[PDB]
Design a protein around this nucleic acid. Structure first.
Length: 74
RNA sequence: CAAC
């Protein structure tokens, strides 16, 4: 729950709706961050598309950094 | 729920 960064922009590398997670590449550091489906703000009410630009917070999850509050840019 |  510890917030590391906010209003980070990134590109969805892939998001798998069967597994319910994917990875976003941060535009500011070029590092991949894990994104779980429950972290996406609202058929797939919580999903993002491969190649999409998204805005998110980076928080400290159980297994390291992860995306939170994932939305479109702006 | 950590490389599909």
């Amino acid at each position: 729950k510890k917030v590391i960064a906010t209003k980070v922009l990134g590109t969805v590398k892939w998001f798998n709706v069967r597994n319910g997670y994917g990875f976003i590449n941060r535009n500011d550091t070029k590092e991949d961050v894990f994104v779980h489906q429950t972290a996406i703000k609202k058929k797939y009410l919580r999903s993002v598309g491969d190649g999409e630009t998204v805005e998110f917070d980076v928080v400290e999850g159980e297994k390291g950094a992860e995306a939170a509050n994932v939305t479109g840019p702006g």
